[PDB]
């Protein structure tokens, strides 16, 4: 319940922040800049999943 909401909300929050970086990079017009922001977002989300999973396993 509250945990799914917590991790889901945070993931969305992280996504928003990641999205912000991608959008800002796109504004420049440099495909390379966007790719760097995108790779960071993908890897960051994968790591975030690791943190959430670890937290759940450590508490539940």
């Amino acid at each position: 319940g509250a945990v799914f909401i917590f991790v889901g909300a945070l993931t969305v929050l992280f996504g928003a922040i990641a999205y912000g970086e991608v959008t800002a990079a796109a504004a420049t017009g440099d495909a390379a800049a966007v790719q760097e922001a995108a790779v960071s977002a993908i890897l960051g989300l994968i790591i975030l999943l690791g943190i959430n999973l670890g937290l759940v396993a450590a508490t539940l």
Binding site: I17, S40, L43, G44, I47, I51, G54, L55
Partner: protein, 225 residues
């Protein structure tokens, strides 16, 4: 333009809230629980200062086409050993055993700091030093220290295990962020790196403390309180 400072301020606020919560929770703590509450206050309090400093734009070091934050590593060097100390107190360690785990922990933290400030592949040798020391620390926490904790009450052993699992599992993620982040191959941008660390720091310090606070009452009841 710079949500970095915003993330640092959020980390500072979270650490401050924790610091105040732990301080208040230990206001009427006994002479046996005292050290525990004081330690938690120190863990989150120091972290709070580091975040405020970074939020103010201080300690930012633009190492070779990358950005590292000195206060982050200084914070770790000073706070992680307090976390180990707290765990060691629950396990019931003696001076010798404490010295061993604190030594290993310091090697880890110092390695990451030096590596972050070092350009070139040499930083990976420093990372290796920290990684090996970390495995030694994990061994002590899951082995010798767990056996020591097993000689305490069921409530203490239970708390030790819960905090030990949280620590081992989440601490293991930091090296991956270091390797993939600005210190290493820099695949993660400063913003993403900082966001992930803010989350991990709050859990490993504030979450860690709240779990202990939640167990306090039960532990008192064990002694007939």
């Amino acid at each position: 333009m710079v949500g970095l400072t915003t993330l640092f301020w959020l980390g500072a606020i979270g650490m401050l809230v924790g610091t105040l919560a732990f301080a208040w929770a230990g206001r009427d703590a006994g002479s046996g629980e005292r050290r525990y509450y004081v330690t938690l206050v120190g863990i989150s309090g120091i972290a709070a200062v580091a975040y405020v400093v970074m939020a103010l734009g201080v300690g930012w070091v633009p190492v070779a086409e990358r950005t590292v934050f000195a206060p982050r590593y200084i914070d770790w060097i000073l706070t992680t050993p307090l976390i180990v100390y707290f765990l060691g107190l629950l396990a019931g360690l003696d001076s010798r055993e404490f010295g061993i785990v604190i030594t290993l922990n310091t090697v880890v933290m110092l390695a990451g700091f030096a590596g972050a400030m070092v350009p070139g592949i040499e930083r990976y040798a420093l990372f290796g030093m920290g990684a090996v020391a970390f495995l030694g620390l994990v061994y002590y926490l899951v082995g010798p220290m767990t056996e020591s904790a097993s000689q305490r009450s069921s409530g203490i052993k239970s708390l030790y295990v819960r905090l030990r699992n949280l620590t081992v599992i989440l601490w293991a993620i930091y090296p991956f962020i270091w390797l993939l982040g600005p210190p290493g191959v820099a695949l993660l941008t400063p913003t993403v790196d900082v966001a992930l660390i803010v989350y991990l720091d709050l859990v490993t310090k504030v979450g860690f403390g709240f779990i202990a606070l939640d167990a306090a009452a039960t532990l008192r009841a064990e002694h007939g309180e």
